[PDB]
Amino acid sequence: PQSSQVTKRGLTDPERAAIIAAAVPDHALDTQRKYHYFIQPRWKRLSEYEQLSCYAQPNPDWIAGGLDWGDWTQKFHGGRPSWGNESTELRTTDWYRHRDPARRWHHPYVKDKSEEARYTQRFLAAYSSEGSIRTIDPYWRDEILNKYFGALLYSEYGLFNAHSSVGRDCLSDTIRQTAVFAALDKVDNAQMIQMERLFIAKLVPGFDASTDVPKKIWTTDPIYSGARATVQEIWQGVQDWNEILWAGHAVYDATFGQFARREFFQRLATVYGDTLTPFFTAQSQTYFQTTRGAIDDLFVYCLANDSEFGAHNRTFLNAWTEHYLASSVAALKDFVGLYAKVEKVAGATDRAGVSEALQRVFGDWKIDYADKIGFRVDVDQKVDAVLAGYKN
Template identity: 25%
Template sequence: MSASTAEPGTAAERSFPKPQFTDAEAGALEFPSSRSRSYNYFEPAKLRATTYEDVTFDVQPDPERHLSQGWLYGFADGPGGYPQDWTALKSVDWHRFRDPNEEWEQTIFRNNANAVRQVQRNLANAALADAYDSWTPAWSKFVERNLGAWMHAENGLGLHVFTAVQRSGPTNMINTAVAVNSAHKLRFAQDLALYNLELGDVLDGFQGSAHREVWQDDPVWQGVRRNVELLTAASDWAEALFATNIVFEQLVGVLFRSHLLMQIAARNGDYVTPSIVGSGEHDYNRDLAYTRALFVLLTRDDEHRDHNREVLNGWLRTWVPLSIDAARALQPIWSQPQERTVEFAESFDVALHGLRSVLADLDLELPEELNR
């Protein structure tokens, strides 16, 4: 061991390894906007990117865009993080989709909070104004059984269809829109549950638990229940989305909510239920907007339009008869209210027209059942 050369009373200078910085390619390259703090790694839909695009686009990784080395992770049976073969539909660029509602974290909380506050205000105002005093026993029974039963449909779709598939899409833009759809359904189901509890407190003889027996055993509702349960079993995420938002909602959901409840409630002295159901119908209109935008993109795809139309027409042949059967099974409830201002045939014709209109926008064939 060599003797120290430091002078007495002074510490010896110590040496440490020094980091060597090299110019990694990505950090060394100079390009336009190198020093800009604005994001331009994607092409915005308009002249400038919106906040929605900035916080949503490319959050979900994709080897076709930035992961040149392939997926960073994968499933045990082989496929990478977001396989495109989780649906039979194809696209030259799934990233072209933009949600026309531009939903992101802030809008999700803001819009749902506003809806909840409005429902709570409506219920509070109804109680103060004794709005339930004008309800007839027949209408009270109708709401008790049928609106309560519909709560199960909304909850089943939100929890077991949209929540189940909201991770399956190939881009974050798609999955965010589906996740918001799930939040809409679950919040509306919760609104109906709270409304059911409210009615149990203010209406004499209102059986708040009757909806369980109706959903499980009433023959009128078994077609709807079967349709919803089969939707929860669809393994293709795009098929589940298409069969729910395009077919089931048009033929059954809108039929029940808009073309029955919203039409006849006021004639039966009920001005409260339409305000609750209207919030759910507003949600669906927004969800239909993004669904329509997605499937228009696919049916007009530069390379895969013919393939996609063939697949979607096949799904129509499967799901349209099922939803028509569910709708027709509901026909008896049109005669239950004391004041019947609309006939089932009239309501059903309007629902069929709505579906025909959507399918025309998507350039799809009308199934035989819609041509009768």
């Protein structure tokens, strides 16, 4: 017999359920059963995603979109508000307008990544039992993949940490969700690169999955010099949370990151007989496209076309793009020196091949981001600036 009462449940205990039934009215006291029915729906019907996310952030009317009133109850020493307009240069009539087109609240997001988590481990168990690593090119495996794909994990890790102040500073709930999920996918990319290296180490005697050599390459090899400078600036040089998100995902990761992940490591895997690396880059590229859907909605649909501040916001976005595209072009110009270390494959690692890869990256970027904010870009000029770093 325990010291405390064994509480009777009102759902099942006869005496308490009878008391409850006598208390419960015999009719509903209102007919509006839609949770937060007053949200303005983005789509033809209010979504559960919106109902659970929108106006969770308790902004007052002096932050655009807020429904509350009055000052915060406690501010920073000196007076910095809990959240405030000073956090970013961009302006809008309603910070709540943003919608992730994938409609991710927490549950669908961890549900999908759980699928990938478990399937990845079944895939590895079977890939090791298959022996398929036997046909990978050993120089690619040991000298290019291990070392420079490994070093790329530090770019992903830095973009992850650039989100820390965004998670604190940004001004609405759907934005904060978009940013935090983007950060987890970036640190996931870094962890999956290391997971692949650790996995190859179990199959290839003498293959070293220590990060010592990748990290030396990230921190001191000229090939990653421009890239590391840009990441360091996006992560720790600025605090405007819109600038971090734009520079990080819409400029740097969409040009340098897409080139490194998709045009170098993923594409060249399927020229050097690497049946393992495409399984891993499939995940980072899926994540990139999901993140882009949300980044695009925040900056194109909402901020670049806001009825009162669209042109104002394009002034800042165009200035950020000019600076960070220069940084990213310099990163790519450094990075294409890596082609001097790979076995020549016509149409892939020769000058024409690299030129067409750069034409894809800069051309896709012009369509996906630059045209949508009014940023003029000469693609051939950017391709030629990077090719100045290519050793013929």
